[PDB]
Design a binder for this molecule. Structure first.
Ligand code: STI
Ligand code: CL
Ligand code: CL
Ligand code: CL
Length: 306
């Protein structure tokens, strides 16, 4: 089962979310996997004054089977259960009557964070971008803010007993004002053809982001998400590089993780952020920081840079 602690079969779908599907107008695909996709759409009458707005809509493809139909309804129940939160992609509505399940969220102006970092990598500026302000250079200040916002969103998920299990820059969205939103593409990512997912047993898993207890024992906990957040930090401060660069996931990789090999600091990581990474990758889950502790650590770093 994919729910470590919460039980979505006992969580109620709040009908306040229900939206008439005929008021959606579908546009371009934002991401697609084997069985699901997310599309841009315009929603009419979602706003009380009958102004139009752009949203993102998740739906299954005709390729989908009963398992995926149940999974999408479970996902909707979990998002409804989580409720509103500024660091999580905002649920706006859903369509459950009169057709297949549709899940409607806000549209995030700048897309996923991994591609944003790669797009901005070549013009990154560590300190002090004035006359150059119009270019919207990526700065160290932004990276610290991203780390802080994702940690705050993850502390929220943990406070709801929710385990992400695929925390990574590809599952962070960026909107106006350098604001991040944790999401989960899930079935709307083509993991079959994504080299960041690796065949393990009968599954395709994000092995380079996974804690050892998740790889070898299929254990998913608050503490295993913290390990993934450590890998996410490495992506962030390497400006979108793939982790363990040049290492295939093979028997040698699993042995090195078990033996205690860990990545060195990426080129742009402040020492105190690498400190967080190292503690997130402790072999002992009980010695990793909590997300709440990470939030307090990074908040101090941000106030000390200013
Ligand atoms: C339209 C939609 C429907 C559902 C979701 N779902 C989630 O974001 C999500 C996040 C966390 C959980 C919690 N869950 C707990 C259990 N573990 C195993 C999985 C995660 C569930 C759903 C997002 C979206 N939004 C979305 N998804 C992908 C891309 C985009 C997008 C892309 C580009 C521009 N703007 C938006 N927008
Ligand atoms: Cl469906
Ligand atoms: Cl969960
Ligand atoms: Cl060190």
């Amino acid at each position: 089962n994919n729910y470590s602690y919460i039980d979505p079969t006992q969580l109620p779908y709040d009908h306040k979310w229900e939206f008439p599907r005929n008021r959606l107008s579908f546009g371009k695909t934002l991401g697609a996997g084997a069985f699901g996709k997310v599309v841009e759409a315009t929603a009419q009458g979602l706003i009380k004054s009958d102004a139009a707005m752009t949203v993102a809509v998740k739906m299954l493809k005709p390729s989908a089977h009963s398992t995926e139909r149940e999974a999408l309804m479970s996902e909707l129940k979990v998002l409804s259960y989580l409720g509103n939160h500024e660091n999580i992609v905002n649920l706006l509505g859903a369509c459950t009557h009169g057709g297949p399940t549709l899940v409607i969220t806000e549209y995030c102006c700048y897309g996923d964070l991994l591609n944003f970092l790669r797009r901005k990598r070549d013009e990154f500026v560590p300190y002090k971008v004035p006359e150059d302000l119009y270019k919207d250079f990526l700065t160290l200040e932004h990276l610290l803010s991203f780390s802080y916002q994702v940690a705050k969103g993850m502390a929220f998920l943990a406070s709801k007993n929710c385990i992400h299990r695929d925390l990574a820059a590809r599952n962070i969205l960026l909107t106006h004002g350098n604001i991040t939103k944790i999401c989960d593409f899930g079935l709307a990512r083509d993991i079959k053809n994504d080299s960041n997912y690796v065949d393990k047993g009968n599954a395709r898993l994000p092995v380079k982001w996974m804690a050892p207890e998740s790889i070898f024992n299929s254990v998913y906990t608050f503490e295993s998400d913290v390990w993934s957040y450590g890998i996410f930090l490495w992506e962030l401060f390497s400006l979108g590089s793939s982790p363990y660069p040049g290492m295939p996931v093979d028997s040698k990789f699993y042995k090195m993780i078990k033996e205690g090999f860990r990545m060195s600091s990426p080129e742009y990581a402040p020492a105190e952020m690498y400190d967080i990474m190292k503690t997130c990758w402790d072999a002992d889950p009980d010695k990793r920081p909590t997300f709440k502790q990470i939030v307090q650590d990074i908040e101090k770093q941000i106030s000390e840079s200013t």
